[PDB]
């Protein structure tokens with residue numbers, strides 16, 4: 001699931017923009033890391049969850 | 051690899067294409 005984005009999605013849209021985001025002057029080289037966060041992450045569903 | 055299919059200088063042809071709310075409409 002996507003955690004953050006810089007634009008809202010209109011209803012019934014499929015977007016191929018699943019790239020990285022940057023939050024610093026340093027070059028991230030397209031690799032996830034601190035100040036180079038990735039928007040897509042899992043929730044790790046488990047039976048004990050609410 | 052498919053989800054949907056459809057089958058239906060003397061000339062001037064005019065078309066209008068619009069796409070809103072998941073609907074793709076054409077006028078001719």
Ligand SMILES: *[C@@H]1O[C@H](CO)[C@@H](O[C@@H]2O[C@H](CO)[C@@H](O)[C@H](O)[C@H]2NC(C)=O)[C@H](O)[C@H]1NC(C)=O
Nearest residue numbers: 005006007008009010011013014015016017018
């Ligand atoms: C529909 O897809 C286009 C193409 O990806 C989206 O346009 C991008 O939007 C992001 C969000 O700000 C920008 O950072 C990119 O620069 C835009 N262009 C490209 C080529 O990626 C557009 O946002 C999508 N529609 C909606 C409603 O989000």
